[PDB]
Design a protein around this ligand. Structure first.
Ligand SMILES: *[C@@H]1O[C@H](CO)[C@@H](O[C@@H]2O[C@H](CO)[C@@H](O)[C@H](O)[C@H]2NC(C)=O)[C@H](O)[C@H]1NC(C)=O
Ligand SMILES: *[C@@H]1O[C@H](CO)[C@@H](O[C@@H]2O[C@H](CO)[C@@H](O)[C@H](O)[C@H]2NC(C)=O)[C@H](O)[C@H]1NC(C)=O
Ligand SMILES: [Cu+2]
Ligand SMILES: [Cu+2]
Ligand SMILES: [Cu+2]
Ligand SMILES: [Cu+2]
Ligand code: NA
Length: 499
């Protein structure tokens, strides 16, 4: 069952074996992935998070981010530790009480403390639209049509070296899959469809690192949503999905009744499908209960290319149709050396006092804010352009902005910008050497918004900056509840920190 929009959510430690290998984890709702949190557009969500964690090897503090939800007027509920709150300590709870005006689509939630979401705290978050403009394109859209793609590690996250190339041990599809080494024939996930029906499959990358080449043997996929943004229909036979991205696609159950492989090939870790790694099963009602015998093609003739995507609505692009054609045009210098990432010469290390609390206490320019050099102010009611030229080791890096989606004016592997009708999204691959992926948005959401690579190991190694958007209006726009004001005193008392 789905939970929400008003619900408790307990965060616990437990042993799990999603690939046949037992390890302890950090779980929401007792499962991997966590339960789907769901509501309708414009609803009030009140997710009361109970921190019941006791195992220090995966951290006993926590904080949860609602990925892709704008949090307008509720910046304190966004979740990134030391940006918008101090962590919740064990034995305490915290009500994330916010609204979702003007958004409907496929989202997710995850820990936003250190690399803790890798240890298991990740689940889907769906905001349905009772008047969805795409409703007539499918018959079925429910918890059974959500498809999660996850990387899974046998080593606990707090034992992964900082700045290292860290590699997973299994790909999990809907929580199940097989290990790349010492492979055992552990259970594979089954997605069941009825011949003749059309399904809104909500594809969610809950990855901590790899991108996946996702396909379904014998089937094609008609994309209708990208990171919460409705798209024109685009039919493809393969989707390369980067960490934290989402797509909805229509699956037409139009092939013979049978079993078909679902494939998710990561860019690192195990390559291919031997022993049923990187796989799940699409089963038609009436098919024999047996593994598929289907083949992938040698090459995919209609792969997703990001520049083929266009919004369903007339969203356009803000600003002027040339590079630098914005009120505040930025170019970030994105680098890696010696185990640490940097942005504009500064490696991100979380501050002692969360950025939002520093601003509410009166710090009112970005040079007064800590960490020094890690906070850039943005002016209010202005068009922002951010160029993100690639080249830093460990790519391709999927960059994500909190508090906003953005027009993708230039995509990976294509030097031509699009000032007319590019897709809008919230997480974007910045590509490869020489690329100049560039995003635009307008500043109508006061508060500190994190910008970072969504490969969680890279974030931990410093690949982040904070956009302090409209510092002067942050306090008036974001009134804070007493429970939020209580978090830093409690956290610092528990950890013997003086501030
Ligand atoms: C990416 O595009 C940005 C502009 O959006 C380029 O920025 C210019 O960089 C040059 C020096 O490299 C400066 O003289 C300009 O002030 C910058 N802004 C402009 C021209 O609008 C950046 O060079 C591009 N990077 C790559 C690798 O192509
Ligand atoms: C590279 O990106 C550009 C810009 O998004 C793509 O150019 C568009 O191509 C479409 C489809 O043919 C035309 O309708 C648009 O007028 C083009 N826009 C511009 C500004 O040129 C181009 O197709 C992409 N390249 C590849 C190989 O897909
Ligand atoms: Cu996220
Ligand atoms: Cu986010
Ligand atoms: Cu990265
Ligand atoms: Cu984030
Ligand atoms: Na425009």
């Amino acid at each position: 069952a789905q939970i929400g929009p008003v619900t408790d959510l307990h965060i616990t430690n437990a042993n799990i074996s999603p690939d046949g290998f037992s390890r302890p984890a950090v779980l929401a709702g007792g499962t991997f992935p966590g339960p789907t949190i769901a509501g309708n557009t414009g609803d009030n969500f009140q997710i009361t998070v109970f921190n019941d964690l006791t195992d220090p090897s995966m951290l006993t503090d926590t904080s949860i981010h609602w990925h892709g939800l704008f949090q307008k007027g509720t910046n304190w509920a966004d979740g990134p530790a030391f940006v918008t709150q101090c962590p919740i300590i064990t034995g305490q709870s915290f009500d994330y009480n916010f609204n979702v005006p003007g958004q409907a689509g496929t989202f997710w939630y995850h820990s936003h403390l250190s690399t803790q979401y890798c240890d298991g705290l990740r689940g889907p978050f769906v905001v349905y639209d009772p008047n969805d403009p795409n409703a007539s394109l499918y018959d079925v859209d429910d918890d059974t049509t959500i498809i999660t793609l996850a990387d899974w590690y046998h080593t606990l996250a707090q034992q992964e070296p900082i700045g290292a190339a860290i590699t997973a041990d299994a790909t999990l599809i809907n929580g199940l899959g097989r290990s790349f080494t010492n492979t055992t024939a552990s259970p594979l996930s089954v997605i069941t469809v009825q011949s003749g029906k059309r399904y809104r499959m909500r594809l969610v990358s809950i990855s901590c690192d790899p991108n996946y080449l996702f396909s379904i043997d014998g089937h094609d996929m008609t994309i209708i949503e990208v990171d919460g943004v409705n798209s024109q229909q685009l039919t493809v036979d393969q989707i390369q999905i980067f960490a934290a991205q989402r797509y909805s696609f229509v699956l037409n159950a139009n092939q013979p009744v049978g079993n078909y492989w679902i494939r998710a090939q990561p860019n690192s870790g195990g390559q291919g499908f031997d022993g049923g790694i990187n796989s799940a099963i699409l089963r038609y009602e009436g098919a024999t209960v047996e593994d598929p015998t289907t083949t992938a093609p040698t090459t995919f003739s209609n792969p997703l290319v990001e520049t083929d995507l266009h919004p369903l609505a007339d969203l356009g692009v803000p600003g002027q149709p040339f590079r630098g054609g914005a009120d505040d045009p930025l170019v970030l210098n994105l680098a890696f050396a010696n185990g640490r990432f940097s942005i504009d010469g500064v490696s991100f290390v979380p501050p002692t006092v969360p950025v939002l609390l520093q601003i509410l206490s009166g710090a009112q320019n970005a040079q007064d804010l800590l960490p020094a050099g890690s906070v850039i102010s943005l002016p209010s009611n202005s068009v922002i352009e951010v160029a993100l030229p690639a080249g830093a080791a460990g790519g391709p890096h999927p960059f994500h902005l909190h508090g906003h989606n953005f027009a993708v004016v230039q995509s990976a592997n294509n030097a031509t910008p699009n000032y007319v009708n590019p897709i809008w999204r919230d997480t974007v691959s910045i590509g490869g050497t020489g690329d100049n992926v560039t995003i635009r948005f307008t500043t109508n959401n006061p508060g500190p918004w994190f910008l970072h690579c969504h490969i969680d190991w890279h974030l931990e190694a410093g690949f982040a900056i904070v956009f302090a958007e409209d510092i002067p209006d942050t306090a008036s726009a974001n009134p804070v509840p007493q429970a939020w004001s209580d978090l830093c005193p409690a956290y610092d008392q528990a950890h013997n920190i003086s501030t």
